[PDB]
Amino acid sequence: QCVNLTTRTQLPPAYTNSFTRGVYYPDKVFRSSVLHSTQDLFLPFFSNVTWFHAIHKRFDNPVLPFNDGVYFASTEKSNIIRGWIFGTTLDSKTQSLLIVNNATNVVIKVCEFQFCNDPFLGVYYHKNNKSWMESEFRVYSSANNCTFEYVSQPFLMDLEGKQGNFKNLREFVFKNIDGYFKIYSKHTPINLVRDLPQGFSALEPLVDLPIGINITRFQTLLALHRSSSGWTAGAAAYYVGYLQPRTFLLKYNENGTITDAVDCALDPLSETKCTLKSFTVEKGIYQTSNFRVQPTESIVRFPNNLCPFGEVFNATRFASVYAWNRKRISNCVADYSVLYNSASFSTFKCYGVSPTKLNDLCFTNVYADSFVIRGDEVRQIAPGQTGKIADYNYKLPDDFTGCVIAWNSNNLDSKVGGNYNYLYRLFRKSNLKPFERDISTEIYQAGSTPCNGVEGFNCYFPLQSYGFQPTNGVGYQPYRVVVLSFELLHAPATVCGKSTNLVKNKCVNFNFNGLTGTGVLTESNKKFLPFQQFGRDIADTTDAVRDPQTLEILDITPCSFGGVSVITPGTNTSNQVAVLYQDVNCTEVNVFQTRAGCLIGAEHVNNSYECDIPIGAGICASYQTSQSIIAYTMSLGAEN
Amino acid sequence: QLQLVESGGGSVQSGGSLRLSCAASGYTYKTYYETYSMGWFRQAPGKEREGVAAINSDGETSYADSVKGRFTISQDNAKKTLYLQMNSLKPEDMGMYYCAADPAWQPAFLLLRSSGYNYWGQGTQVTVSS
Amino acid sequence: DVVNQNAQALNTLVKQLSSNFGAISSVLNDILSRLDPPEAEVQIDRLIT
Ligand SMILES: *[C@@H]1O[C@H](CO)[C@@H](O)[C@H](O)[C@H]1NC(C)=O
Ligand SMILES: *[C@@H]1O[C@H](CO)[C@@H](O)[C@H](O)[C@H]1NC(C)=O
Ligand SMILES: *[C@@H]1O[C@H](CO)[C@@H](O)[C@H](O)[C@H]1NC(C)=O
Ligand SMILES: *[C@@H]1O[C@H](CO)[C@@H](O)[C@H](O)[C@H]1NC(C)=O
Ligand SMILES: *[C@@H]1O[C@H](CO)[C@@H](O)[C@H](O)[C@H]1NC(C)=O
């Protein structure tokens, strides 16, 4: 519940190592004495595992992740491990997988169980008539929303006193593959050599529950007993491991069990064992895989003339809605970051643009219908809004794409004399056309009077004037309205608008002038004409380049030098090896320079011997006298 | 005509943790996109309709600094449903919440101004007792 | 003739990479980073074939 542990102390994270553990049966398949390999989420050899234990003032309970899949050791003596809380986010809003056994039943409930602030199991009253009674059945608060309650057959809950050795060595492998919360276990009673768990172990499946949920966390229901405020915790430890996608080489016996299990990436000798499908390697040099120089990073060069954005947007001579000055925008740097920092706007409405890729994606033909109107008439210029503007003189179509940008200039365009020169339309004769300037300057005849210029009797003059007083309200302010229309995907893009540094002599992954290339970037010496950009080789590939931002001649040398060569003697002779990389320069990392490549882990000799293990270029290898692997030029014969 | 359905109200105390939700209705989605400029325009008893939590089509959230640090507006574009996790309601959070609509893209300094919203929802009410 | 024979063999083996083999282009990054990956699997399958 909430009673805190008196024996809780922050013990340091002792990083022990899973030596030979982590080998399980993959499925129900039998073979007879083959060397079968596979690759799956495994506990790797000689990898860190966090040492956990209990003592009379150190007793903890870590929230541990269950992301990939976990390994679990347990060196009990008197059942210090009791149960498991396999909760995803340790919440009762979702269902937490509870596993518990009080030496009666392995009770599995896929239910919503609330994690208490300090749940604890344990035993007490072990002086007279003990019978292994339990401390507190208060490891939860809520109990609801059960999909599948389950009781398996109870395992060997060791009520028998087996003290001393770690014979209660419980190996638990837990993972999920497609809703299968599988238990891969095998209780292996140890044989005492010197006090420690190490040896060749094999594990098997026990039960599966096809549930279909995820779990990302776990704790473990511990026990308390004294050889925990009133009944302390004894001396019993365990390890905690994970699962990583290693590649094993399993050897089977005659009658079922695994005999040898060899992980690949532990040393390249084991990699050679993986490749050759043999646990015993004969005498000779071999070849495991390839070598790949890693690309370090990338170099991207953005393009840098400018569109009239300090000119049209900062103009003085303006237009009207009755006749708008259609700006011609074609093949200019569409600087939309200087459109972005302008916080002086009033109404900025971008309908069908790519507003994240303003500078990235660029457009075919941009038409800026910029015209200054009265303040209230901004809400009508929209696909979906009509009225005094949209159906009278200036129609955006229903296939409109572009922005509508407005900002006020009440300090300059307002006047006591008033900006009555910019005239606007009030009535409507014909159905309004999209993107067509209606400049019909004829009297709006609404009757049987042929006006033809005169006003008065049935002669309506809708060509009215802006009253831009210096004390205008919010509806009469002169807004510098720009409806930035454009044309999308009907031409190759003309109106088109943060580069990186230059890194030479390193294996990077550049992106110069559309192509994303990879190689060590040096500087060439050729004669590039200023239009000539791409050097081609005899193999018709990219050889020598130039930055489109800064004029400079470059040279490219590709990465991924050669492959992996493995030098070994006979396995019955020795198990020390030597590493050779195929025709590389000594860069990666004893270290020798040969014509065959950079040699690793050998001794050079000022003599010459008869060739046993050849390498190349008249250089052979041998295991002579401490005995090690020496590198030497081959003896050509007896100088008789 | 583009319409919206406010919901998510609830009469709580001073410091309530609720969530708003704006169900998308209407007939016009006048854009080639499904991402829009929206915002929960609260109109308090005794104050005007004000931009409290607003977000545009790119995700630039617009907040007021008196209510900043508690609320969480999340425009779920896969269902066109605007949300506002009303966390720890101060006593000025009472009011009729209006999610407004726009088929366009507004910046961070114009999402709070309700002058450019020609499509308005119904409205939801939250009673924040002090 | 031996050296030129092996040279023409290696040059032919390199120049067959420039053939498109019925794909969009002979460059792998153009197929993998532009169009549909369930279609790029078909195209890369043709390329590897
Ligand atoms: C385990 O972690 C420690 C960090 O404390 C590190 O020094 C060590 O190399 C790791 N691996 C092994 C096998 O101990
Ligand atoms: C899968 O795992 C995540 C991570 O905890 C969890 O949030 C989610 O509910 C799980 N189930 C599904 C169906 O995604
Ligand atoms: C054959 O099986 C028996 C029992 O099943 C086992 O004891 C024996 O070790 C097996 N043979 C070999 C060579 O392992
Ligand atoms: C590359 O090899 C040359 C000699 O061939 C040597 O001088 C140089 O140091 C080597 N560079 C690296 C990085 O190994
Ligand atoms: C071989 O002899 C040279 C001098 O000729 C000496 O510099 C070198 O160290 C010797 N090799 C070894 C491995 O000691």
Tokens of A284: 């000779």
The CA distance from B71 to B84, in Å, is 7
Cβ neighbours around A281 below 10 Å, total: 20
Q: Of B83, B49, B45, B79, which Cα lies nearest the Cα of B64?
A: B49
Burial (CB < 10 A; 0-12, 13-18, 19+), residue A545, is buried
Tokens of A60: 């903890």
Q: Are A322 and A464 in contact (CB under 8 A)?
A: no
Distance A254 CA to ligand 3 centre (A): 7
Breaks in chain A after residues, C-to-N cutoff 2.5 Å: 56, 227, 304, 497, 589, 625
What's the residue count for chain C? 49
The CA distance from A247 to A42, in Å, is 8
The CA distance from A110 to A115, in Å, is 14
Q: Which chains touch A (3 or more CB pairs under 8 A)?
A: B, C
Nearest CA to ligand 5 atom 10: A606
Burial (CB < 10 A; 0-12, 13-18, 19+), residue A288, is buried
Burial (CB < 10 A; 0-12, 13-18, 19+), residue A544, is buried
Instruction: Give the three-class secondary structure for A511.
Output: strand
The CA distance from A184 to A213, in Å, is 19
Q: What are phi and psi of A204, to 5 degrees?
A: -135, 155
Q: What's the CA angle centered on A585, arms A580 and A588, to 5 degrees?
A: 70
Interface test with A, best of C12, C14, C15 (most A CBs within 10 A): C14
> Which secondary-structure segment (H or E) carries B20?
strand B18-26
CA atoms within 13 A on the CB side of A470: 5
A259 vs A71, A466, C12, CA distance in Å? 21, 96, 49
CA atoms within 13 A on the CB side of C25: 9
Q: Of A140, A139, A141, A159, which Cα lies nearest the Cα of A225?
A: A159
A293 vs A509, A543, A581, CA distance in Å? 12, 19, 12
The CA distance from A310 to A303, in Å, is 20
The CA distance from A85 to A66, in Å, is 11
The CA distance from A252 to A34, in Å, is 6
Sign of CA dihedral A543, A547, A552, A557: negative
Q: Which residues pair with A236 in a beta bridge?
A: none
Instruction: Give the three-class secondary structure for B3.
Output: strand
What are the counts of helices (DSSP H) followed by strands (DSSP E) for chain A?
Answer: 2, 41
Give the ranges where chain C is alpha helix by DSSP (H). 2-15, 28-32, 37-48
Q: Are B123 and B20 in contact (CB under 8 A)?
A: no
Distance A253 CA to ligand 3 centre (A): 8
Q: Are A239 and A50 in contact (CB under 8 A)?
A: yes
- Mind spelling out the 3-state secondary structure of A1-70? CCCCCCCCCCCCCCEEEECCCCCECCCCCCCCCCEEEEEEEECCCCEEEECECCCCCCCCCCCEECCCEE
Residue A342 touches partner B, C-beta closer than 8 Å:
no
The CA distance from B61 to B109, in Å, is 10
The CA distance from A592 to A599, in Å, is 5
The CA distance from A160 to A132, in Å, is 11
The CA distance from A614 to A164, in Å, is 55
Q: Is the CB of A176 under 6 A from ligand 2?
A: no
Ligand at minimal distance from the CA of A252 is 3
Q: Is the CB of A606 under 6 A from ligand 5?
A: yes
Tokens of A615: 């390498």
Instruction: Determine whether the interchain pair A539/C11 forms a contact, defined as Cβ–Cβ distance below 8 Å.
Output: yes
A93 vs A99, A142, A145, B53, CA distance in Å? 18, 10, 9, 28
Q: Which residues pair with A84 in a beta bridge?
A: A99, A220
A517/chain C closest Cα distance in angstroms:
10
Phi-psi region of B69 (alpha: psi -120 to 50; beta: other; left: phi over 0): left
Give the ranges where A262-350 is alpha helix by DSSP (H). 268-276, 337-340
Among C14, C15, C29, the residue with its CB nearest the CB of A516 is C29
- Mind spelling out the 3-state secondary structure of A401-467? CEEEEECECCCCCCCCCCCCCCEECCCCCCCCCECCCCCCCCCECCCCCCCCCCCECCEECCCEECC
Interface test with B, best of A341, A344, A351 (most B CBs within 10 A): A351
According to DSSP, residue C31 is labeled H
Q: What are phi and psi of A240, to 5 degrees?
A: -135, 120
Contact residues, chain A, for C31 at CB < 8 Å:
none
- Method in brief: cryo-EM
Q: Spell out the residues 6+ positions from residue A96 whose beta carbon is closer than 8 angstroms to its own.
A: A85, A86, A87, A88, A90, A111, A112, A113, A115
Q: What is the dihedral of CA A222, A223, A224, A227, to 10 degrees?
A: -120
Distance A603 CA to ligand 5 centre (A): 11
Instruction: Give the three-class secondary structure for A242.
Output: strand
Residue identified by tokens 């941009």 is: A366
> Which secondary-structure segment (H or E) carries A247?
strand A244-252
Sign of CA dihedral A543, A549, A553, A558: negative
The CA distance from A46 to A105, in Å, is 36
